[PDB]
Amino acid sequence: MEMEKEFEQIDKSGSWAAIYQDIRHEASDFPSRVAKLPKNKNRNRYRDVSPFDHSRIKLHQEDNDYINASLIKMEEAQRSYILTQGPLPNTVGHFWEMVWEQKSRGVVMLNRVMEKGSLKCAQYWPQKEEKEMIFEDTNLKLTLISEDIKSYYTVRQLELENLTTQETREILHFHYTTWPDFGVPESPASFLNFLFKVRESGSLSPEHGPVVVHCSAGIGRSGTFCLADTCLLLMDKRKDPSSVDIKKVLLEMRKFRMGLIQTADQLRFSYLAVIEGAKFIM
Ligand SMILES: O[C@H]1CN[C@H]2Cc3c([nH]c4ccccc34)[C@@H]1C2
Numbered sequence: 299m300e301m302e303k304e305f306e307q308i309d310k311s312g313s314w315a316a317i318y319q320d321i322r323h324e325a326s327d328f329p330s331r332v333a334k335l336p337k338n339k340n341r342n343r344y345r346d347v348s349p350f351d352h353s354r355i356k357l358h359q360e361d362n363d364y365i366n367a368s369l370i371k372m373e374e375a376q377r378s379y380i381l382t383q384g385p386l387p388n389t390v391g392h393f394w395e396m397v398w399e400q401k402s403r404g405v406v407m408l409n410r411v412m413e414k415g416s417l418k419c420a421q422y423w424p425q426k427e428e429k430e431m432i433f434e435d436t437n438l439k440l441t442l443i444s445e446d447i448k449s450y451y452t453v454r455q456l457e458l459e460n461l462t463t464q465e466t467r468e469i470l471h472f473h474y475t476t477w478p479d480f481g482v483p484e485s486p487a488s489f490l491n492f493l494f495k496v497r498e499s500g501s502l503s504p505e506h507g508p509v510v511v512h513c514s515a516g517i518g519r520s521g522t523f524c525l526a527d528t529c530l531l532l533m534d535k536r537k538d539p540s541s542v543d544i545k546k547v548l549l550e551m552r553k554f555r556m557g558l559i560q561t562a563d564q565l566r567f568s569y570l571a572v573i574e575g576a577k578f579i580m
Contacts, residue, residue: 300540305569318562321545325552328352338364341392343383347515353554355380357392358399365392366516368555369508370524375531378508379524381555383516384409384419391433393422394440397469397510398460404470404501406511408519413479418514423456423471437461443468450476450488453495472496477519482563486571490578493527502527521558525551526571533576544572 299307308314332338333348341364342348348366349355355367366389367382380400384407385393397405409418423440424431430441443455454471474492476483483489496502501509513519529547533539548568552558559565 301542301544301569302573305573308566314562314566317545318559318565321548321552321559321565324549325556326549328553330354330556332364333366335364337362340388341386342366343386344515347383347517347557349555355382355396355400357395359395365389365396367396367510368516370551370554372528372550375528375535376504377502377524377528377531380508380510381516381520381524381558382510382512384512384514385422387420390420390422391436391438394433394438394458395436398438398458398467400510401507402469402501402510403506404472404496404499404509406496406501406509406520406523407471407473408477408511408513408523410475413514419512423454432461450474451492451495470499470501472499472501482567486567486574489522490526490571490575493523493575497527515557515560517555517557518560518564521548521551521555521560522564522568522571525559525568526575529572530575530579533572534579539576542572544569 308317328350330348330350332351332354333342349368353368355365355369356363357365367380370379370381372378411417411419411421424442427442430439432439439459439461441457443457446453452473452475456469456471457466458469459466472495476488500506511520511523525548529542529544532542536542548559559568
């Protein structure tokens with residue numbers, strides 16, 4: 299079926315939970331043996347969210363190459379994404395090592411450091427120009443260059459220096475700051491505006507390594523971001539845009555990381571975002 303009318307048909311019939319449970323039943327199950335090794339327990343935020351072995355990002359280290367991060371490679375859309383958990387106190391150096399080694403231009407953050415009164419990720423970037431951060435375990439230096447605070451999101455320019463080679467690179471930090479502590483946004487308008495700002499920066503384009511996107515577990519809000527982006531790109535590329543099937547795209551993405559889209563409300567919000575987004579593109 300088309301999307302906008304499939305949408306109203308699920309609303310009128312109130313069957314979002316049944317649709318979402320079908321997706322959960324059909325989703326791929328691949329091994330995640332490296333994630334579950336005992337030496338990696340303090341590298342995982344949640345015991346039930348792990349990268350598959352076949353698609354995990356490897357650190358360029360011979361001691362321990364493990365990080366909780368996955369490469370989502372979308373062949374028809376010609377887009378790639380790295381989805382990862384919010385960094386832990388003992389993985390902030392690994393996080394920036396990954397950004398460096400994978401040649402990423404942009405980092406997309408969809409959570410606040412504290413939500414619901416608890417810490418959802420480490421404070422992993424510097425908050426003042428004159429107070430830079432050094433990650434001694436991976437030999438990197440990170441400096442805040444500029445910050446632009448808007449009503450729904452903040453954009454930061456960062457300098458990452460590899461202290462071993464003295465090479466430097468400019469990284470863009472795109473921080474969506476207004477996702478509610480509970481539920482999903484009422485309108486997709488600010489989330490779509492944010493997606494378009496990331497696109498306009500070049501961070502999603504083939505001349506760079508894959509964008510790094512995270513929330514707390516790296517599957518819910520993060521899944522919503524890449525699902526909406528890929529569906530909108532396919533609607534622009536195909537002769538028949540009504541042929542794009544958001545449930546089929548989501549199941550394709552779940553071949554590369556488990557659990558993408560965590561609730562039936564996030565599934566409905568993803569439909570809404572693609573529907574409204576397709577009208578603005580034209
Ligand atoms: O109620 C329907 C209206 N038309 C479509 C778009 C749309 C819907 N709900 C929304 C809420 C906020 C923004 C846009 C929408 C449903 C489907």
